[PDB]
């Protein structure tokens, strides 16, 4: 019950009582990004380098916390990591503490949701990696270009 | 292709990658002589500190 002139009530008069530091402001964040309870979170623990795999699963059509445009456009750009059961699958490796792996997967998830939710994204194409792809595409286009009615 | 494997063959679709053999390092020596500091990091197991008994 001792006090000094430097104590925490005198430095900060506004918030004093013990209960004030421990209150929970659930209303300030009401959007609850990524409602973790509805995700399947798997841990593959390997040891040799130590690498703890973080796995992240949810059903895209069945997930309500994402709006329909978000649902459908996250199913397009990302179709490579989608599973036949309708699952979107996220993978994390680098840390050997599974905490950071979870954080990485949740972050990739927030980035896919962000990039999809922003309509103004022009998906900028680099000509450096895709130049050979554009050339080979045009060149197979010149062969496809033969016009005769078939079948 | 994804339409094939699932609908026809009732099978998960395989995905392959390209692996290039890990760069060869000479045996590490107890007193590496005349080497840069970063020499130590070539034999690095994984990147994370480990406080052994601490």
UniProtKB/TrEMBL annotation, chain A:
Annotated localization: Mitochondrion
EC code(s) of this entry: 3.1.1.29
GO cellular component: mitochondrial inner membrane; mitochondrial large ribosomal subunit
Domain Prokaryotic-type class I peptide chain release factors: 32-151
Coiled coil (residue ranges): none
Catalytic activity: an N-acyl-L-alpha-aminoacyl-tRNA + H2O = an N-acyl-L-amino acid + a tRNA + H(+)
Mitochondrion as UniProt keyword: yes
MF terms in GO: peptidyl-tRNA hydrolase activity; translation release factor activity, codon nonspecific
Keywords in alphabetical order: Hydrolase, Mitochondrion, Protein biosynthesis, Ribonucleoprotein, Ribosomal protein, Transit peptide
Domain of life: Eukaryota
Positions with biased composition (Basic and acidic residues): 130-141
GO biological process, one term: mitochondrial translational termination
Main function: Essential peptidyl-tRNA hydrolase component of the mitochondrial large ribosomal subunit. Acts as a codon-independent translation release factor that has lost all stop codon specificity and directs the termination of translation in mitochondrion, possibly in case of abortive elongation. May be involved in the hydrolysis of peptidyl-tRNAs that have been prematurely terminated and thus in the recycling of stalled mitochondrial ribosomes.
Stated family: Belongs to the prokaryotic/mitochondrial release factor family. Mitochondrion-specific ribosomal protein mL62 subfamily.
Record-given protein name: Large ribosomal subunit protein mL62
Organism: Sus scrofa domesticus (domestic pig)
Complete-protein stretch covered: 38 to 195 of 205
UniProtKB/TrEMBL annotation, chain B:
Compartments (UniProt record): Mitochondrion
Lineage: superkingdom: Eukaryota
Family, as annotated: Belongs to the phosphatidylethanolamine-binding protein family. Mitochondrion-specific ribosomal protein mL38 subfamily.
Name assigned to this protein: Large ribosomal subunit protein mL38
Residue numbers of the full-length protein present here: 327 to 380 of 380
